[PDB]
Amino acid sequence: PFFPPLYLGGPEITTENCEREPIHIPGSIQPHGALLTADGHSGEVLQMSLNAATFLGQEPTVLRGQTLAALLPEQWPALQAALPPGCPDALQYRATLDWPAAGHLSLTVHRVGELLILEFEPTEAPHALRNAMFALESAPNLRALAEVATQTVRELTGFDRVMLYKFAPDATGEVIAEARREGLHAFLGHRFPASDIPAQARALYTRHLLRLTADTRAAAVPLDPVLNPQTNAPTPLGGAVLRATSPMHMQYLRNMGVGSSLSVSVVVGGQLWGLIACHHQTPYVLPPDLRTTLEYLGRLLSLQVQVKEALEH
């Protein structure tokens, strides 16, 4: 099963009980964005991140009464149609708001049962993706495909280190390709134990295909209330990219000297084949539109891995 989260007086996590931390329900988010939850029917704002006032420019109480209808007039009917009752928690809808306080915000919404989860992040506003797609497809074998993928991602993102991280049948991991800035340790060829990514992290990564720690030293921002009014239970946040990272994994990233981290699942035959794993030495908020490019690349790599593995077997 899972332990209760901390804020419901559950045990603190160790290397004895890695597998039992409820990472999906941390009750908090990373501070480079803001999150609101809301009722599926009424559009009634039920929870907000204590930092919402910053991003939205709204007097705190104003929000926690109001309706999405009021708050987002153009958007609220689109949401209603895009995310019908009963849809999967994996389905997401995005829009760009030109919002008074903040030039442009990206809005990302998904639905978990009766709750809409809304994420707001700063945003903005060429051929590198098309060029990359053809490059991946003409790679002659899996090894070269891995090399092209890591190089392409590094060029698109500027990340200090991009790895392709492949799982063995026992969930042992192996770095099979790597693109990195001069003057970093090489992780190429190295293998790491299964517990470095515990079973409950792997399952959640099979369904929700991208996560990131934008700053490995930033404090999480609580949800208020912490419990969903609807259920008097924790809000599931695993489909939210803003979700606070496990402190265990923040300790791991800090001990390696990483300041910003991101990864993309490569899913083949319904299973987690591996990860595009990215490191930056310093804090780094990759903007939403560039993340989208990596999300596309994730799908394309999933296709090409199967194609390429089929021409060996």
Ligand X SMILES: *C/C=C1/C(=C/c2[nH]c(/C=C3[NH+]=C(/C=C4\NC(=O)C(C=C)=C4C)C(C)=C\3CCC(=O)O)c(CCC(=O)O)c2C)NC(=O)[C@H]1C
CB within 8 Å of 45: residues ≥ 6 apart:
36, 37, 38, 63, 64, 65, 66, 67, 68, 71
The H-assigned helical ranges of 139-198 are: 142-157
Of 245, 260, 265, 304, which lies in the binding site for ligand X, with binding defined by CB under 6 A? 245
- Complex with a copy of itself: residue 112 or 250, whichever CB lies closer: 112
| Contacted entry of ligand X, a copy of itself, none for residue 15, CB cut-off 5 to 8 Å set by kind | ligand X
Whole-number Å distance between alpha carbons of 306 and 167 = 15
Interface residue with ligand X, options 40, 173, 234, 239 (CB under 6 A): 173
Residue 18 counted as an annotated binding residue: yes
| DSSP H helix total and E strand total for the chain | 9, 15
Out of 87, 186, 203, 290, name the contact with a copy of itself by CB under 8 A: 87
Handedness of CA 28, 29, 35, 39 (dihedral sign): negative
Spatial CA neighbour of 287 closest among 262, 267, 265: 262
Point out which residues pair with 175 in neighbouring strands.
Answer: 165
Asked if 307 interacts with a copy of itself (CB under 8 A), we say yes
Establish if 126 lies at the interface with a copy of itself (CB under 8 A): yes
Sheet with 271-280, side-by-side order of all strands: 191-192, 173-180, 161-167, 271-280, 260-268, 210-213
Q: Does 76 bind a copy of itself (CB under 8 A)?
A: no
Nearer to a copy of itself, 120 or 187 (CB): 120
Residue 133 interacting partner from a copy of itself, ligand X, none (CB closer than 5 to 8 Å by kind): a copy of itself
Is position 70 an interface residue for a copy of itself (rule: CB under 8 A)? no
Q: List the single partner that 246 binds among ligand X, a copy of itself, none, CB under 5 to 8 Å by kind.
A: ligand X
- Per CB under 8 A, the list member of 63, 82, 176, 226 interacting with a copy of itself is 82
| Tokens 């849809």, residue located | 87
Q: Are 5 and 234 in contact (CB under 8 A)?
A: yes
Picked from ligand X, a copy of itself, none, the partner binding residue 75 (CB below 5 to 8 A depending on kind) is: none
Between CA 142 and CA 145 the distance in angstroms is 5
Breaks in the chain listed by the residue before each, with C–N > 2.5 Å: 125
62 binds, among ligand X, a copy of itself, none (CB under 5 to 8 A by kind): none
Instruction: By CB under 6 A, tell whether 263 contacts ligand X.
Output: yes
Site residues for a copy of itself, window 223-252 (CB under 8 A)? Answer: none
Based on CB atoms, which residue is closest to a copy of itself, 280 or 291? 291
If one asks whether residue 147 binds a copy of itself (CB under 8 A), the answer comes out as no
Crossing angle, helix 128-138 and helix 288-310, to 10 degrees? 10
What CA–CA distance (Å, rounded) separates 313 from 309? 6
Q: Which stretch binds a copy of itself (CB under 8 A): 131-139, 157-165, 224-232, 272-280?
A: 131-139
Report d(CA 155, CA 6) in Å as an integer.
40
Residues that bind a copy of itself (CB under 8 A): 82, 87-88, 90-96, 126-127, 129-131, 133-135, 137-138, 269-270, 292, 295-296, 299-300, 302-303, 306-307, 310
Give the binding site for ligand X (CB under 6 A): 13, 15, 18, 21, 23, 173, 175, 187, 192, 195-198, 201, 211, 213, 245-246, 248-249, 252, 261, 263, 275, 277
